[PDB]
C-alpha cells in the first residue's frame, strides 16, 4: 500500500522526499525515502530474500547483474513516455532484451579548461602536444588528468575504434572485445607519445591533477561533475566543454546512467511505475531533486533543455551522447583489471602497445 525507496547518500534524497510528499498529496500514498549505509551491497542481499525497497536508485551498470539474479522487475513504459527520454539512456537500462529500470541522470567526463590561461580550448588531441610547448614557455602545462584509472584514459584510447564489449540487439558479446584493435593501438600510442615527449607525466593521478588544475598550474584537465564543486572553491575561471577529438573522431568516455529500478518482490509495482513516470520523471520532480543536490545532466529531454542553459551540463550531455555506455555485465571487472595493467605497462615503456593490448585482450 506504500512505497519504500532507497537512494545513495550522496544524492538529493530530500528532493526525492519532496517528490514523494507531492505523490502523497495527489494520491494519499505515503512515500518513504531512505539512504541506507552501504546501499550498494545492502540492496542485493535484502532483495535476494524477497525484501528491500520498492524502488532502488543506482548506476545502470550494476542493475544488469541485479536483472540476472531476478531482483528487478520489467518496466512497461509506453511509446509516448519512451519518447520523453533520450534513446541512448534507454539503451543503458536494457538487459536480456527487456527494460529493467527508468533512466534518471546521465554522467560522463568532460574537458575542464582554465579560461584565463586558455580562452579557446583545443578541439583535437593532436593540438595538445604543441599547445603544451607554448604554456611551458610561461611555466604552465596544457593538460593534467588522472592516468592511474582506465576510466580516464579510455576516452582517448577508444576514440578511433576501441570498445570494451561489442553491443548489438541489446546484448553484449563477451567473446567480442575490441581492446587490441587498430583504434585502441593508435589511441594508446598517442598517449604514450604524450608521456614520452614530457607533455604528460606517467605518475600523475587524481590528486596531482586536481591540485595542479585548482591551483592554476595546468591549463586543462579531464573530469566529471563531481569535481566541479572543488573547482568552485578554488575560484579558477574555468569552463567545461567537449573532450578533444582523435583522428577526427569524438572521445568515447564511459557513460554512467543513474536509473531507478523496481524490486521484483514488490507487490506495488503499479504504484512505483506511476510515481516514476508521472511524478519524478517530470520537470517539477527532477527540479525538486536537483535543488537538493545537482543531478548534472538528466535523461528527460524537457528538463535537460532547461539544464543545458548552463554550458557545463550541456558539455556533459554532449560527451555522454558521444561516449560509450557502461556495460552492465560482470565481465567488465576483468576489463578493468586488464586495460589498467596495459596502461601501467605501456606508459612505463616496459611493454609495447601491441603487447600490452593483446595481453589485456584475454
Residue numbers in the entry: 5 to 366
Which sentences did the original study use to describe this structure?
Strikingly, within weeks, using an essentially identical workflow to that used for RECQ5 and SPNS2, the homoDiGb method was applied to 43-kDa MBP and even very small 14-kDa hen egg white lysozyme, achieving reconstructions at 2.45 Å and 3.16 Å, respectively. Lastly, we also observed clear structural evidence for covalent bond formation as a driving trapping force for formation of the DiGb complex. In the MBP:homoDiGb structure, there is a unique interface different from those discussed above or any class of nanobody crystal contacts. The side-chain-to-side-chain covalent disulfide bond gives the Gbs a ‘U-turn’ in this joint, enabling the first β-sheet of both Gbs to come into contact but not close enough to form direct hydrogen bonds. Nonetheless, the resulting assembly proved constrained enough for cryo-EM structural determination, with or without local refinement, further highlighting the value of this kinetically controlled approach.
Here, we show that a generic and kinetically biased ‘Gembody’ (Gb) interface, previously discovered through trapping in crystallo, can also be trapped in solution by kinetically controlled side-chain-to-side-chain bond formation in a manner that leads to ready generation of complexes; these display ideally balanced interface flexibility and yet relative complex constraints, in turn allowing rapid cryo-EM structure determination, even of small targets. Ultimately, after a survey of in-solution covalent bond-forming methods exploring differing natural and unnatural amino acid residues, we found that Cu(II)-catalyzed oxidation at a pivotal C12 residue site (together with the presence of needed Gb ‘gem’ substitutions previously discovered through iterative X-ray-guided engineering) offered a route to direct and rapid, high-yielding formation of disulfide-linked homo Di-Gembody (homoDiGb) without side reactions (for example, off-site oxidation) to form a robust covalent interface. Furthermore, the success of DiGbs for high-resolution structural solution is enabled by their relatively small mass contribution to the imaged complex while increasing the maximum particle diameter for better particle alignment. In summary, our plug-and-play DiGb strategy improves cryo-EM resolvability and resolution of small proteins through constraint and increased particle size with a simple and robust workflow and can even enable simultaneous structure determination of two challenging targets in one dataset.
